[PDB]
């Protein structure tokens, strides 16, 4: 039928025809995200796909959706915080989401950042920018199969990181609160401290909770090997940025790959002026042994494709009164 798609990305636009054909449906793209202003635009539609910028706070929207026969909120993301479930239940609109879009995409960004820093390519470049094309011992590297990898958390994504590294021959240790037999071939569970002590490469794969805010701080960097490489492609708030920067400057660790940062929402996904970018980012950005990507581990064709198709699939099912995989409503 006709499904409204709000807040389409440049990348989602490229998929529309394929998607229309595959699902035998029409997509109606609207350039802003859904809000009391432009809800009058789903009148001609049977369902709705959202990428909310900011909260759906008012109920004039939640009502007018019900009026037009819409029975679902189809989210093209994992995050649900913009969705007032108070109102959702009230108007009988269920909510679907997209939790798993591509674990390998994030995983591969993690491994990639780790590789580059291990090989010290940025430091070399910094050396070269100043005229130094030597091979000093300080920039000596090592084969990845001589490395121990430490995962904090596993999940779909950590599971994938281990698969990859273990496939290159590295030894992989993980701390976790749940035991999962699936990953045993690829890693060995150990506890938190042995993992911080013995890892050459550490990568974060922990959900953000009040209990894990700042779980990597000054104490942990000191416990880490001085030539270790931290990677955080999980949640910025897991790491104490200042403790990081300091650990970096005092050489208590060797490098870092960050696809997330605390207080990122202020500048990530945005165009901005110098005066708008925070100073901690600028510090990390100026370091040849640091990578920062703007939270784009996810950003592959498959992630983008799946974000559309999984959300559409569920949303159509609930337009037919059929059953949808990824509810979050009862």
């Amino acid at each position: 039928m006709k499904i409204a798609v709000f807040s389409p990305s440049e990348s989602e636009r490229k998929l529309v025809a394929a998607t229309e054909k595959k699902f035998g449906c029409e997509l109606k793209l609207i350039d802003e995200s859904l809000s009391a202003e432009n809800v009058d635009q789903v009148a001609d539609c049977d369902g709705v796909l959202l990428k909310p910028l900011g909260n759906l706070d008012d109920e004039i929207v939640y009502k007018k959706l019900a009026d037009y026969g819409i029975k679902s909120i189809g989210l093209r993301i994992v995050g649900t915080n913009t969705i007032d479930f108070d109102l959702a239940k009230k108007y009988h609109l269920t909510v679907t989401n997209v939790p798993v879009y591509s674990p390998r995409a994030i995983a591969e960004m993690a491994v990639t950042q780790a590789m580059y820093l291990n090989r010290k390519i940025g430091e070399f470049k910094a050396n070269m920018d100043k005229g130094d094309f030597t091979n000093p011992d300080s920039l000596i590297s090592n084969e990845i199969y001589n490395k121990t990898i430490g995962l904090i958390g596993v999940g779909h994504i950590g599971s994938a990181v281990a698969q990859i590294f273990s496939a290159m021959g590295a030894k992989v240790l993980a701390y976790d609160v749940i035991y999962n037999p699936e990953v045993e071939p690829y890693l060995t569970y150990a506890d938190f401290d042995t993992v911080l002590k013995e890892a050459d490469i550490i990568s974060l794969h922990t959900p953000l909770l009040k209990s894990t805010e700042n779980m990597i701080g000054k104490k942990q960097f000191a416990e880490m090997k001085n030539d270790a490489i931290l990677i955080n492609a999980a949640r910025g708030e897991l790491v104490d940025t200042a403790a990081l920067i300091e650990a970096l400057e005092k050489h208590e660790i060797a490098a870092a790959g960050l696809d997330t940062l605390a207080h990122e929402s202020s500048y990530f996904f945005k165009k901005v002026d110098d005066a708008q970018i925070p100073a901690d980012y600028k510090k990390l950005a100026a370091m040849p042994n640091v990578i920062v990507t703007p939270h784009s581990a996810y950003f592959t064709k498959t992630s983008v494709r799946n974000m559309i198709e999984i959300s559409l699939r569920d949303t159509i099912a609930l337009a037919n009164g059929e059953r949808a995989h990824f509810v979050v409503s009862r």
Copy 2:
């Protein structure tokens, strides 16, 4: 026994003591390369270990080796272009080398640079510098298991690139003029032209011969995919640098990672002033979709140790009358 060592790296120095214990021999360390000037320091030595800066022109050195009972010359490296094998023969100096110190060192540089450029991490950084923290579609990436790898030449190193990439799920194609059943679990043989046409990532592993100089030029960039990544951790002269720069500038290929570059001799392995760095490097280094490392793919602990411990071991054998594994002709 005592084996002399010429012109070690500062990281070669770091292993010395460990090597002495592990072999149970002494290592008379001389900073500068062997010459008529320092040849007499070998008097009290059994065998010799060589890293020649330059051609070994003088003959009075080859005589004096054989007058000191030196029965072989142990290249720590793979090159031979300074050994006058004619003089070696008269003085009955058998000549060993190290051809295989760490294929995976180099394979991993090549993989590492491919993944970084695939994830377009430097293009993201180039944006972030100008205030842009978005995810435009021009920087969308892909999972490695959706890419095709094309190898020109295989060899020890290429074989290793194929193992790793195919272990991450990629299709690996390879062109070679010699068949090796060993590598078929990891790749599929194809014609040169089909490799260029079909490969998303192309990595060169072809020796520099007279018939392979500028093997990749204008014609061949023309034949590649326009989102292709070209990796050269082999020999700079395999690639026509102007053809490459033009191809990059015109977006006829997507990225390149080069550990080696035509005309590098003049500045690789040196400290130099802006004026001494060529203009073709300055262009490449300015491109956020390019990586240049200073021929450091080899540079791991493992390599540095093997450069020493493999030469030593054939040098001690030949001194004891035994078999060396890496004797060399012409």
Copy 3:
């Protein structure tokens, strides 16, 4: 505390001390499974672990459990059919289970059987038993990386089979009703018929439903490649045994590995006399190109360990009024 363990296996007995220590609890093993007769034995216990032979039909058991403070039925299996949930809810006894004990154990049995039949070791043995130590062409094999694998269903177990085979270099196709991004690196989804047509090795990984009873029958064997190898380490009822036997005898397929068979419960896990074993089994047993194991893909140390520990873990939690992973009760 003290947890009763009913119907302990010989293998579970070997784990008890380790388990007691790890969980800081006492295990009380009872040789029969739980029944109205011996329920008076959990009086001294705080929870209960079951391996039911046959249905828990009567409620004298379900009551007397409640009387003694027991708040859970802790199953050391996946199957719940013996559990009268009518009565469970009635006595406020929740039910836990063990769905995932070791996917790799089943997966590895599958791969193993497949390998052996591909290499034709049994046919060779049959040849040898008669005095033939030749290498006839009919018993020529091939490298596994020249093979295409077909999975019907994926799941945890199929996912694992693909990982392994793909790691050996084989091409892996799967049909499935759900899309799972996790397995894309290891297989390629295709539809049912292409998979039956193009696979050299096919393995079943489909749950038993009325819709999948006999889904492999005469029609399918005919569609399969004549030199293909079917493996069923899923559910016996998925395959039409007579259609199988016939396909085997007419050489419409080449071999089969079966850890399950229709009407197995009559003899599996049992000691029996010749007159007690069915004729279809005896036929398949007499074929050198057939393996039948008595439903023991699961049977490793890890499966057995996990079956105990996962069921104990949950069961203790519910003894404390804490939360248990694997409920099946509401």
Copy 4:
């Protein structure tokens, strides 16, 4: 051109036509091995392709080759023990061979037999025959990623066994007298004795020399784990068959898979009567924890094709004056 072929296998016959087209040459097929009796059939031939049953004793054959312009002798196999290299030299017959036709053929036999015996599939069958369909603890297995593999010798084949096993998650240890950096991602080097002590699965990949005959005897079985699996797809004479049988009978090791056996010449590759089969084979074949295959680890399509297409290719080159890759000394 025309190349004669002597004593092809019936599976060698099957490839002939395909080979002719792929090379664009003829293949004059002669059933029996080259002799003074059939040497004259080569008159109209360019080069020759050899599978000698026996010693090439006569000299008048070597003369007549060189009178027919035959410049080389192309062994399709790896053996040389029937080539009188002395006579080859006078007649200027350069002598090629095939040492590397398919390392993975054999590696995969070795892996296949290890997994079958680890899963104890034959011990289960031995039980099922006697009416027992249970899962006693004496037949419990384990996941491959919990086992340690020990390789005595590496080589092309051993290297392949290490790749596969380490790709399934196992720890691989190897003893060798030569260092190869290439294999370090897949295994870790150790002493001979620590390999025997620590390995759950042991696979031999050591050439039969005078110094390796009965390399595995009573002493060494004594040193192995008592649930160890010994795999010999190398050369029978590496193992003391009586020591092995005694070790099995006494349960000093857990299983063995042998593709090769001391004194096999007398019955491997033949059809024979009970009376002609030795008693040490009869014992082994009776053990459900043993596998004997008739030296067929090599036997894949790929091998058979390479035995022909690698010899052909060096034989055509040498006939055209070009370089052969597998010329042989002594």
